[PDB]
Amino acid sequence: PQPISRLEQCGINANDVKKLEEAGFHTVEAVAYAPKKELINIKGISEAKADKILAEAAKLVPMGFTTATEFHQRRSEIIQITTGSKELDKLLQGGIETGSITEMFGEFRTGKTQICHTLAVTCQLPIDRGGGEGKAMYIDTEGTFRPERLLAVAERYGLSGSDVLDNVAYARAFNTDHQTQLLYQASAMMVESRYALLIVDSATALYRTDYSGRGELSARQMHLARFLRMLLRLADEFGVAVVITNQVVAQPGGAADPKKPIGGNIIAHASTTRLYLRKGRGETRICKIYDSPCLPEAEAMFAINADGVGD
Amino acid sequence: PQPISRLEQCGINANDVKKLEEAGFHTVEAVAYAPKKELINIKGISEAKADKILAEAAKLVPMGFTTATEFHQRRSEIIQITTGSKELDKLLQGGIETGSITEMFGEFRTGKTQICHTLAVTCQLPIDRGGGEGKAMYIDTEGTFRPERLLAVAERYGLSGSDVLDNVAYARAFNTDHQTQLLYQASAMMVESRYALLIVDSATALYRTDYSGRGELSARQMHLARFLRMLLRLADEFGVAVVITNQVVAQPGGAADPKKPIGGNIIAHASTTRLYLRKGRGETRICKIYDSPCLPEAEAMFAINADGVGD
Amino acid sequence: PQPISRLEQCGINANDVKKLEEAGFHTVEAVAYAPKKELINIKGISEAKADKILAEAAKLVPMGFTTATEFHQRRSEIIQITTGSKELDKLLQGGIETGSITEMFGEFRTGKTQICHTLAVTCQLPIDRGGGEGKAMYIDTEGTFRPERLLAVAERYGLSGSDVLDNVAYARAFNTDHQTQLLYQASAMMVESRYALLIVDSATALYRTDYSGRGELSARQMHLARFLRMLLRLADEFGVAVVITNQVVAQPGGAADPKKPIGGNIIAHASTTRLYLRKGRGETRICKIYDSPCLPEAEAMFAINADGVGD
DNA sequence: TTTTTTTTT
DNA sequence: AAAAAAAAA
Ligand SMILES: Nc1ncnc2c1ncn2[C@@H]1O[C@H](COP(=O)(O)OP(=O)(O)NP(=O)(O)O)[C@@H](O)[C@H]1O
Ligand SMILES: Nc1ncnc2c1ncn2[C@@H]1O[C@H](COP(=O)(O)OP(=O)(O)NP(=O)(O)O)[C@@H](O)[C@H]1O
Ligand SMILES: Nc1ncnc2c1ncn2[C@@H]1O[C@H](COP(=O)(O)OP(=O)(O)NP(=O)(O)O)[C@@H](O)[C@H]1O
Ligand SMILES: [Ca+2]
Ligand SMILES: [Ca+2]
Ligand SMILES: [Ca+2]
């Protein structure tokens, strides 16, 4: 992806390109994927130059109708990240794919942050061993990152211990406003270095307590829908796979599984791949594909041990 | 439909016909179906020639009162596209008809993009096997097109794999402004080649996040009403059937089904055929006719398997 | 942690800093960890100064992306409090850690307030003998504190009897509203003196009787989720370890351990370390790790005698 | 015109 | 084996 230093080849002053770096449009695709309405709200941008900054941006990126046999060629280089086990790769037909949003949920001991700890090491492998190249990013909301679990998986694949821990960016969000502000700093780091998985663990922990009651429900869902839109804008800009962790609630009053995830119909439509984790005989757990555009509905089996997620 | 090259037979200069191709009036019916007020806003068109360009256009197309026994004859050649199953053709009395707008909605795993993947292959069949002739068009908003599902339905009907994928145009919209701009390029492609289904998956995903709050509600609905007007103008120009995908919201505060679609009273009046999809025992799902000018209210049953939508 | 007396170095009037001490933001980290939405609800705070009070607070605390090899360095100084026995330290790999929430539950004679009486004396030891330095805090809901059990454990470690009892703050909650109000006075005492364990015995005794029935379930869980959020805000501000005591209920209607704790899915996701206590041959009891981000699932053995919890 | 939450015994 | 309530933009 090209930076916005290519935009002095219209004739824009250099000061206006400094303004766009304040607004988070660090990449030239972020200008072309943005509407005209949102570009006006930057202080110092008029109607005339915002007409010029959008049409000149549509020079450099291809936006228009193409053939589906050319888009089928472009899906052939999609990287799929392995999860550590052969049984989960039998479900996802190669693992978690890049350029998309994947959501995992379940109650309370089903290993949601254990997969996210295993995936931060398999995303640094060479592509011949599974997974892609690059570093990783971890956005944490409840305060469970523990780095002693990352070193145990590098013990399994034989990687260096210090090279694994130094190539992981960590940031902790303390409220819903700080959670959105960490995405603007995330887009400013991806243009220097090649990345992989952006992990938002868990995304919906802070939305349950900052907005409470029926009276503050509509203000909650508009903030969550804007947050899931920026995660979608990050996945197509840099080719980053996104992993989202959710929670569940019970249904006291239904009639005849009773645990459905939170977020309503906004997070249900925004996420495209959804996995449902539940516990069996706890040595092992059970993964089940809940919603996917391509994969059929099936199940698999887990293993959580000292070397990450296994068979 | 006749192109606008027939309009030098008034005495217009050739330069003014070049101007109308900038404004999207590629077909001679698009001039006659347009008001005088909208033709003035093209740079270089005066009051005198716009009076001449409209009345000369009303020479070539029939606009006026006719007998209903002649319009009943003209409904006899309406093509109806099959959906793949015999159970849904029992509802729609032959399938999805051409020259109209059809809307499907439901929550989150009810197979809305699975019907739209099945319909992009049955619209290329010969007319003796069901469906019509021509290519297909897919406008995508959330990024789920996957072409590996298109090849699995060509495995069912025995068509060639490469001939199916090469005859589908694909374009991805990134905001609401780009979604309207893809319709002007759509009207410039239909005059060379015979087409079929224009699929706008989903139409109302981007309108939830670009315009938020009660203060920006009135600016949202005026853009959506102009977008549904251009889809209606495409259906009568070329005889193209339009399939629209919608989403749902919940009603926290009503009293006694609770999921009603989004778009308000604008998309409810503009769309004329509406199908409500819900899930039963998930192997199968349930379709229900919600609103139609001719079809009675009834239900049917689904099947989603490896070969598309089945029985 | 810095007090909010450092906030006259923006240019705020001294009266607005007096207002924040009414709202419980006694520490400068409590301003930076708070959202903008919650700061507006203080009487006398406008939109302009609340924008200034948050960005100036983000000067003094580090909030942003860092390297995981630097966060791994910061976990090396985490204090772990001993529980009195060597067998429980073999489970927790050093004992109860600081900066987190630990939950213990079991039925009715499993020694839940006997561990909490033992931990109020081992948290005053020098760090060479196990545990950390500082005083202790006990929030009681059912009225069982008895101080004659605290003197018996100081008999074991050889500490002074009067110095142990004088360094423990005690407060009894009488309803759920008074239980939340004791946390605002708790944050105003930690900035003068160095502390340790905040013990909320038991947290969920009063929530069973003040809110009863299915009709008052949703109002119960929103109050409990706000209470567990303030306990999490206390643990990262001052580095205080939090110990929570829970109760159990039976499941009349399940099919094949039958005793699951109360609080639903809110207290299950908020607490990160959970211990399950049950009784064997009562001289001894059995501890079992139920849910932890790092520790594996195993068991241990207890001893309750005259000198606290032993081997 | 928009926006679902919440397990007891 | 059988249970119910909740609101603001
Ligand atoms: N080193 C380890 N060896 C084996 N099992 C472990 C180890 N560390 C953790 N576990 C188990 O892994 C699970 C932890 O799952 P985890 O995702 O961290 O919690 P969770 O599902 O997120 N619930 P919560 O974080 O409270 O919302 C528990 O079953 C632990 O017993
Ligand atoms: N190859 C397949 N075989 C069987 N079932 C499949 C297959 N591919 C997808 N499915 C199922 O079909 C459904 C997909 O529905 P789909 O319409 O694509 O999502 P959706 O209803 O649009 N929700 P969303 O796209 O997020 O708004 C899911 O139930 C999948 O499990
Ligand atoms: N043959 C039929 N038998 C029974 N019900 C029918 C039949 N044809 C249509 N309907 C029902 O009649 C209703 C449609 O009535 P209609 O007058 O078209 O409402 P409408 O307001 O005009 N729709 P719209 O034009 O978008 O505003 C729907 O509920 C259909 O299910
Ligand atoms: Ca977790
Ligand atoms: Ca869809
Ligand atoms: Ca009508």
Residue numbers in the entry:
A (entry chain B), B (entry chain A), C (entry chain C): 22 to 277, 282 to 336
Paper excerpt:
During HR, a recombinase binds to single-stranded DNA (ssDNA) and forms a right-handed helical nucleoprotein filament, known as a presynaptic filament, which then searches double-stranded DNA (dsDNA) for homology. Eukaryotic RAD51 and DMC1 both catalyze strand displacement and strand exchange. Interestingly, DMC1 possesses the ability of stabilizing mismatch-containing recombination intermediates (low-fidelity recombinase), whereas the RAD51 lacks the ability to do so (high-fidelity recombinase). RAD51 and DMC1 are members of the RecA family of DNA recombinases and share ~50% amino acid identity and similar biochemical properties.
In the double mutant RAD51-VpDg, the volume increases again, similar to DMC1. The RMSD values of mismatched DNA are substantially larger than those of homologous DNA for RAD51, but only slightly different for DMC1 and RAD51-VpDg, supporting that DMC1 can stabilize mismatched basepairs. Analogously, the Loop 2 reciprocal mutants DMC1-PvGd and RAD51-VpDg changed to 81% and 100%, respectively. As expected, although the 15 nt mismatch substrate is closer to the 15 nt homologous substrate than the 12 nt homologous one in WT DMC1, it is closer to the 12 nt homo in WT RAD51. As shown in the other panels in Fig. 4f, both DMC1-Qm and DMC1-PvGd mutants displayed similar properties to WT RAD51, whereas the reciprocal RAD51 mutants as well as the triple mutant RAD51-MqVpDg behaved similar to WT DMC1.
